[PDB]
Amino acid sequence: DQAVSKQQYADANAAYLQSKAAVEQARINLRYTKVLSPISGRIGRSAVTEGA
Amino acid sequence: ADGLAARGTFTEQLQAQRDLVKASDEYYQLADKRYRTGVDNYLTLLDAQRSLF
Known part of the structure; x- marks a missing residue:
């Protein structure tokens, strides 16, 4: 019913999407900590043990 | 002499x-023209209407 501007809605929606991309780019690092295997196959031995 | x-x-x-x-009235028409494109609210358009009235 147009109680706020279309432009202020566009700016707030831009802030929404521009913070949602920051959540994506900060979730990429949590996916990097659990080190996913890049390809399927037979793994050798762990060069670094836990703690290093 | 009063008259x-x-x-x-x-x-x-x-x-x-x-x-x-x-x-x-020109200020009201310009506030309406800012309202029709979307950069301005409706409450400021109503403030311009009340100053016109």
């Missing part, structure tokens, strides 16, 4: 007042 002074001054007073009404 002569009032007939002498009310033409200038109403010319000034009609120029005020015309300037406030």
Whole structure:
């Protein structure tokens, strides 16, 4: 019913999407900590043990 | 002489007042033209309507 501007809605929606991309780019690092295997196959031995 | 002074001054007073009404109506039309494209609210358009009234 147009109680706020279309432009202020566009700016707030831009802030929404521009913070949602920051959540994506900060979730990429949590996916990097659990080190996913890049390809399927037979793994050798762990060069670094836990703690290093 | 009262009637002569009032007939002498009310033409200038109403010319000034009609120029005020015309300037406030142009300000309302420009606030409407900012409202129609979307950069301005509806409450500021209503403030311009009430200054016109």
